[PDB]
Design a protein around this ligand. Sequence first.
Ligand SMILES: Cc1cc2nc3c(=O)[nH]c(=O)nc-3n(C[C@H](O)[C@H](O)[C@H](O)COP(=O)(O)OP(=O)(O)OC[C@H]3O[C@@H](n4cnc5c(N)ncnc54)[C@H](O)[C@@H]3O)c2cc1C
Ligand SMILES: Cc1cc2nc3c(=O)[nH]c(=O)nc-3n(C[C@H](O)[C@H](O)[C@H](O)COP(=O)(O)OP(=O)(O)OC[C@H]3O[C@@H](n4cnc5c(N)ncnc54)[C@H](O)[C@@H]3O)c2cc1C
Lengths: 518, 518
Amino acid sequence: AAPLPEGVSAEAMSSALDRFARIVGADWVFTEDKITPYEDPYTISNDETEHRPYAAVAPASTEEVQEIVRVANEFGVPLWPVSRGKNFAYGGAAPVMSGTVVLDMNRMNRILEVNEEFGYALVEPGVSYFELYDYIQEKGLKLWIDVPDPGWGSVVGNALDHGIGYTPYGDHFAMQCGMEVVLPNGEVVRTGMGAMPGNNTWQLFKYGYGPYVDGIFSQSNFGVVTKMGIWLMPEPAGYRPYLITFENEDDIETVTERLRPLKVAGVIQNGATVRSLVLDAAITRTKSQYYDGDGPIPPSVAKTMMADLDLGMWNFCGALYGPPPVMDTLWTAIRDSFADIPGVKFYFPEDRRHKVDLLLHRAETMKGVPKLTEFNFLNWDGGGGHVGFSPVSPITGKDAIKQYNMVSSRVREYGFDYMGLLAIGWRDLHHVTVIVYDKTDPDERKKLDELFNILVDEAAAEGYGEYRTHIRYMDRIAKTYSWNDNALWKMHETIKDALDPNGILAPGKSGIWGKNRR
Amino acid sequence: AAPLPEGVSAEAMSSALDRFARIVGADWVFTEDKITPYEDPYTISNDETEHRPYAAVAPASTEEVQEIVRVANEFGVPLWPVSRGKNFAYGGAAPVMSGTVVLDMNRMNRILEVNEEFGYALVEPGVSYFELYDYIQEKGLKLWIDVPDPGWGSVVGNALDHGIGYTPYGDHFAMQCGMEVVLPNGEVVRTGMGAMPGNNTWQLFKYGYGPYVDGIFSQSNFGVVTKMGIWLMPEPAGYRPYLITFENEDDIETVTERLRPLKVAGVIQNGATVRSLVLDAAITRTKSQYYDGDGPIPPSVAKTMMADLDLGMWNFCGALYGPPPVMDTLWTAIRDSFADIPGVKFYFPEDRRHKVDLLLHRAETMKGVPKLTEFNFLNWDGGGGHVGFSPVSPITGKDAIKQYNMVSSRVREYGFDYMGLLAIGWRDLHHVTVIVYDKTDPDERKKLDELFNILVDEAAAEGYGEYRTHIRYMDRIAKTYSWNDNALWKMHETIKDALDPNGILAPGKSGIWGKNRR
Ligand SMILES: Cc1cc2nc3c(=O)[nH]c(=O)nc-3n(C[C@H](O)[C@H](O)[C@H](O)COP(=O)(O)OP(=O)(O)OC[C@H]3O[C@@H](n4cnc5c(N)ncnc54)[C@H](O)[C@@H]3O)c2cc1C
Ligand SMILES: Cc1cc2nc3c(=O)[nH]c(=O)nc-3n(C[C@H](O)[C@H](O)[C@H](O)COP(=O)(O)OP(=O)(O)OC[C@H]3O[C@@H](n4cnc5c(N)ncnc54)[C@H](O)[C@@H]3O)c2cc1C
């Protein structure tokens, strides 16, 4: 059971837990044996009093949110907002600090608007990708949504954390437009056009007038987000998902070189993802099926996985969108960029001899379909937890191969398999490292923790920095953005002390602490 | 001559001007008769005491900028940052509050980088569209810029003020990525990946890590931007500008209905502008050759203006960009959207009998070429001054024609010709009123001011709010954004006090005043 947070007497807490009970009822304030679904499901720390929520209030309306926050102020008790708390690999529901009261907003799951003609939604935090998909399919509206894989999570929560998907609307927060925010002092505000009485333009024009501030409430503890609009892609006129595989590990250098101009110009219309053999193999197989050793898979077994599954060492999944004459012209350009590489194979779905297969699973994500497979890369090594390192780099052959060499060496030295991805949004490259681990074994937890810290250090040194991370590592990732003795984070703390003078919102989110605890 | 700001002695002001000239050098502080170019070129006020800058100071570098800002805190003297200060329809280089010192960053004009492979540029505030386009050409870089019409101003200032242009990169601040900011306390920060030392990714990935704050320094007085990256469209494989004209003034309703889907699915790849006959005639004609009288042009004349200029009542020019196969597909989808309207005509550039012409002139702008010509809204009625009203609205026929009617009637009622434009970014329609008028005449200035206030009130009362405005009206536009007793401006005022406690940056900007002056 979790301790109190330093500064909060037992009376103050228990008073506040009763005053929270007034505001939302006594059935929607959770303690004790009801608390554990909001623990980190993939624990990394071997000290068991870190990332431990004291309680979990669960309001149903914006107004409750406001009082909660006013009470939180009154008793000096900190809160930790989560839209749905399916933030797996990042801590799930749990706070950075022990003792903070989770503020859960599953209950505020009203899809407030879905406009077909203008291509947007207005949703509250609780709305899941599944819920929003379904409501669209039931009404037969000709709109796609843009989805993580698997499609756990909140439309809102995923976006606020700068999350990403697999269609042209892949940059979730880029597609955001208008939000309502409960400030730390209890007051509510609407950004953009939503600050105009009588507007019909909240989800039509991001800026509004004057300082553009939506972004400060993303990867932030500056407020609580109670509604958010997002743009949604009109159902296109055509769709052709594809896979391009490469034989050799070294091919990732030339592949990244070829990908650059296609991505910088928008020729490839969604995110480009080039995945290593084991990360894609892990969509349909486990390690035990290919190798019995405790260590990482040997060359000879890779060759066997590649022949068996018609994957490469590298595996480029992508999709063409819009009308057929357009899709034909983009294909011509993309295909001719890769054709002259020894060993390259190209595949549309109908060229896939297997009926369970990478491309058929990926095609669902690249058309906005939230799919919940019980078979992914978590199962690879018998099951457990995952963590991901996804730093930014320039889209260059040299930057890719370097990251690959650095990470695969270290990852394999520590006994894990290399599960890597090269991902391009538009002008950004991300070498994403996935490490699966047994989160019940304390010695493996030690290995992972250490390996992680070394990867951050070595990548920072090469100018590569993380954009999204686990609650455990939030302070560490803040420390990488250290230009001029932490000038940026000094400003954030200025803003934090002004909006939240009593430090009751998500203390330590993104490394932002507030004067009382700093 | 101009007065001291209230709360600022001449002892203070005089010692602060010494230090300034100690920092930058005596030759780069301006007073007396050298303030004349920092005056609003297009005056609206009859009160000769308002929007009058006490002095200017022209730093050579970011660090001189910091030095000045520190001096400004310690003597309570306020600063009005301008990049090149060419903000002509919005009060130009002058400040809301008289006595404010102009901080003129035009000497800070380095092109720090232009990168071809990654399509981007890093620029100081003084860099003009013309300097950047010329740099690019000198070096033979296959990049386009995105430019206003005409293109006299600042890549940075325009972008910070939510400027727009005529390519797919038409939304300037959208395309921005990374910036260096001198805060109101004199500390300097870098945003995004720029906060990480050794990064090569400042201009490739907006977010960095944690709260997204670039927006807070646009249309704001929260800091002074000293560096900014912007993304730059790579050279397309083909480019075809077009013009479509509409016979009847009522055509705009159904036209706006047809633009919606084409714009939302991105079939029209740049901003969609639909201009009124009179707006173009008054660039490349005179009033007296069509109608002799003192008042606004009668319906009679319109049919004559139309045949003379080979235009319509509404005139839509856009451009297709891509390999010819893709442009063809788009043209077909766009021509077929409008083919069935009575009176529609279709023009490519070589179909234009006139070589001084809207399409030919716009073909330059929609491929990112900045131009000055011998033309503008003068030599129509001996005007000189102009001001714009550009609120946001849904893309509907009903909304378009409704604002057409609302505005024209009122503009004509006040003696001005109706000069209008319907523009669509992505999901956002603006009906834009250009109001041309005599700067010199105090009788037309008065009427302009009564007319402007009405337009604001009436558009606001239907839920259409402005996104960009003249220094004179900043408070009024701000007060339309009033949901929940001006909650949003109450938050901005909070932030202003934390960052700028002495209130020395640009008091009034976007109606943001801060504690001392409220
Ligand atoms: C196997 C696997 C695959 C994954 N694949 C992807 C993928 O493809 N793409 C991807 O983007 N992610 C991916 N993830 C990460 C994660 O599981 C998803 O992003 C998930 O959909 C997001 O969780 P959520 O929506 O519940 O967010 P939440 O946990 O509800 O919110 C995220 C965080 O943001 C803040 N926050 C959220 N809502 C609010 C609010 N209303 N007000 C204030 N602060 C708030 C909090 O600090 C919160 O902890 C993957 C994870 C795993 C384990
Ligand atoms: C005939 C005519 C046509 C026009 N056409 C267009 C058009 O097509 N598109 C368009 O967008 N505009 C247009 N404009 C408006 C205007 O001329 C342009 O926006 C111009 O490019 C802006 O001048 P600038 O870049 O020098 O801005 P500046 O005056 O330098 O900056 C504008 C404002 O931004 C802020 N600012 C500037 N620099 C900084 C900084 N470093 N830090 C903090 N705040 C800062 C200040 O508040 C300043 O008042 C037109 C105007 C006229 C008169």
